[PDB]
Nucleic acid binder design. Structure first.
Length: 692
RNA sequence: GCAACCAUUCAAAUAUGUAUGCUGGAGCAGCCCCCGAUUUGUGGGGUGAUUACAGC
RNA sequence: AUACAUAUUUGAAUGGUUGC
């Protein structure tokens, strides 16, 4: 239990962790401070007070020296216990206590209740097992620390306590992934695109893998366009809905509202910002994939100049330029005005149509849809409109089937003279949401079917009181320009008779990928119904956007194709590299390719008879797991050797060093000699090595 | 042929926090209808607005 | 009830280990 109780061969789990800390300190000497500050870069709120931050900044040499001392202590049979003492004074102790209390707070505040206590890092001026685990965490990948904690925890009886304690102790540990300089998001996007493409389009699923539920084209397109074009940045959303262009938070969601995004293009003399729809986005992706991205972005950048030129000469400009201008501009210059009579007719027809459809659909409509309709009726009949609180309260009643409380609400509005007795009364004969909804539809349609009076024009929103100056509207418009639908199409494919889908198909066939979707083509067309009927248009468009997404995936894989000197065979359901076959999805969030020598030796030494393609699962079970098992035995053996004693020597040192550092830099013959010397000195183990 | 343990992915259920209204402007954008059409069209209409909008 | 985030439980698919 206490750290003092780990003597001789029992030290092994700590030997492995601390040697890895040194392995990693030799790759990067800055890891203590890097790890301590990792999370605080993402926090407005200080993780540390000012003096703590100061101590952290000075601590590299101290922490690196302590790392070496403990590695020495844990790698020897007998070492002086002095290194296990941290005084109250100790810089490292203060740092550790602050970092730990911070981690606990971070854990607890995300839980619904406080269930457990956390282990102390210190007892008097002596580090505990938990303290030693915490110290090493700063230097090692999550998998190393989990392996250590798994060996030394007294807490595994209670799964919940074990995992929460582990969460705190492992707060500051490195990501498993060697390649990740926190820009390996292309790996995750690759997997996400493949996962989405493998889901069957909803409409095809219902007719004939999981079902696709969400269209993620825009999300993928934004990640791809930002990766390809450093001049471009899309609006991110936060709720205080605020749109900003900060790339400080990677997790932060893109602003996507009704298939619109906000783009900022930084060219020439400074950034220009536009709203861009799905239509323009998908053409931009298509153009980017074919190497015309820079040119497309140049044309979008210049778009505002054209608008500004047209704005001065609306009356005289070519009618073709009217497309770039909102109604209010054209109407100001006497273009496309409609008689109030015509505006009334269109408005009333629409609102009538909306309410006839609601009336027909009551039984099929959601409680939210029905509640909104009922509230829209009450609100429009109120002297003073609902405040947010009043609205919320009544909505909660309707959604919760609390018709009694809703009717008590109407009574209160009546007693307050906000609604008249008629409005209260029309609901008195109803007991259900559906009945109330029908009554409301009837009252509204009665109002809309009247011979056109002054009250009607106001009711349907044609009655303006407040006058905004045209010149204010123009100014607003100029800072809120949206790209005309079909803009990029007209700039690049003016005289093209090929639709979007055919342009995508032509690029796919001739572009050099030689890929297509891995879903059966039947999932993109219902053979039994006409080309243009039902879901067939939407599925055909989906085939084109999926093909774009496949090409985006092919671009992303390209980045990790650039990294290292290993070939890729990429299938729908596997990646093969020189061979190891990663299954499930792509890898199943795996790595291992970063140490090619080690993977080579793992395969050579633990799987000598296997040739050609080997499953990752097999490499793990027969290789990495087998290595880990052997490593425990060799470290335990080496420590027991030291205890007892306190070409053969060469081999012993090399094999020892290999197992201490988690590599295979020795030959089979050399393990023979190591094994011989262990046998000669009393310490046997069931080596299970070398392999048949 | 079956069970247990570990790892990975998907679906479903439960709890907690936050949001949901009004007025004016905005329909270049998004969406829908009609008209064509191996399908998403710088073809015609709409859309009491869904809002990088201003206030209460 | 809808949207978003966090946490917990169950089932299904895949591989390995153990027992008969």
């Amino acid at each position: 239990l206490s750290i003092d109780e780990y003597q001789g061969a029992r030290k092994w789990c700590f030997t492995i962790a601390f040697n890895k800390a040194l392995v990693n300190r030799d790759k990067n000497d800055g890891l203590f401070v890097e790890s301590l500050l990792r999370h605080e870069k993402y926090s407005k709120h200080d993780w540390y007070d000012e003096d703590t931050r100061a101590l952290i900044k000075c601590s590299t040499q101290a922490a690196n020296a302590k790392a070496e001392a403990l590695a020495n202590y844990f790698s020897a049979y007998r070492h002086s216990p002095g290194c296990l003492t941290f005084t109250a004074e100790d810089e490292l102790r203060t740092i550790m206590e602050r970092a730990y209390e911070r981690a606990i707070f971070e854990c607890r505040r995300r839980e619904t209740e406080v269930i457990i206590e956390f282990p102390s890092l210190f007892e008097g001026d002596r580090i505990t097992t938990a303290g030693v685990v915490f110290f090493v965490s700063f230097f090692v990948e999550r998998r190393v620390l989990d392996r250590l904690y798994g060996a030394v925890s007294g807490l595994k009886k209670n799964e919940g306590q074990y995992k929460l304690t582990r969460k705190a102790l492992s707060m500051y540990c490195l990501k498993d992934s060697r390649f990740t300089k926190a820009w390996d998001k292309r790996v995750l996007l690759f997997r996400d695109i493949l996962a989405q493409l493998g889901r069957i389009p909803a409409e095809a699923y219902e007719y004939y893998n999981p079902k696709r539920h969400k269209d993620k084209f825009i999300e993928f397109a934004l990640h791809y366009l930002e990766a390809q074009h450093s001049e471009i940045c899309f609006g991110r959303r936060h709720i205080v809905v605020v749109v900003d262009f900060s790339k400080k938070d990677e997790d932060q969601s893109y602003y996507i509202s009704k298939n619109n995004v906000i783009v900022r293009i930084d060219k020439n003399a400074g950034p220009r910002s536009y709203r861009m729809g799905l239509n323009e986005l998908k053409y931009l992706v298509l153009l980017s994939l074919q190497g015309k991205g820079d040119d497309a972005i140049a044309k979008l950048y210049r778009y505002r100049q054209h608008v500004e030129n047209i704005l001065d000469v609306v009356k005289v400009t070519d009618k073709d330029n009217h497309v770039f201008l909102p109604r209010f501009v054209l109407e100001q210059h006497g273009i496309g005005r409609k008689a109030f009579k015509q505006r009334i007719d269109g408005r009333v027809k629409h609102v009538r149509g909306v309410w006839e459809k609601k009336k027909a659909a009551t039984n099929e409509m959601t409680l939210h849809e029905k509640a909104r309709d009922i509230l829209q009726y009450v609100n429009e009949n109120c002297t003073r409109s609902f405040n947010p609180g009043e609205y919320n309260r009544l909505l909660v009643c309707l959604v919760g089937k609390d018709v009694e409380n809703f009717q008590a609400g109407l009574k209160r509005l009546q007693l307050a003279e906000r609604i008249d007795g008629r409005v209260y009364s029309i609901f008195a004969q109803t007991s259900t949401i559906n009945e109330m909804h029908q009554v409301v539809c009837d009252q509204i349609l009665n109002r809309l079917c009247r011979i056109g009076d002054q009250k009607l024009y106001d009711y349907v929103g044609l009655g303006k009181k407040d006058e905004i100056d045209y010149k204010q509207k123009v100014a607003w418009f100029k800072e809120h320009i949206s790209i005309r639908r079909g803009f990029l199409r007209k700039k690049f494919w003016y005289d093209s008779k090929k639709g979007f889908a055919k342009l995508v198909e032509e690029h796919l066939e001739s572009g050099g990928g030689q890929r297509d979707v891995g879903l059966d083509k039947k999932y993109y067309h219902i053979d039994a119904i006409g080309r243009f009927e039902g879901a067939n248009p939407a599925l055909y468009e989906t085939l084109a956007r999926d093909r774009l997404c496949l090409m985006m995936a092919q671009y992303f894989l390209g980045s990790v194709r650039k990294e290292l000197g290993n070939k890729i065979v990429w299938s729908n359901d596997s990646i093969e590299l020189p061979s190891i076959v990663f299954s499930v999805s792509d890898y199943g969030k795996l790595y291992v390719l970063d140490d090619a020598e080690f993977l080579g030796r793992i395969c050579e030494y633990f799987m000598p008879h296997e040739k050609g393609k080997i499953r990752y699962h097999t490499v793990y079970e027969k290789g990495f797991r087998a290595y880990n098992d052997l490593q425990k035995k060799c470290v335990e053996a080496v420590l027991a050797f030291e205890e007892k004693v306190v070409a053969e020597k060469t081999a012993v040192n090399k094999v020892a060093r290999a197992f201490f550092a988690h590599h295979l830099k020795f030959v089979i013959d050399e393990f023979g000699l190591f094994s011989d010397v262990m046998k000669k000195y009393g310490i046997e183990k069931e080596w299970k090595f070398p392999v048949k």
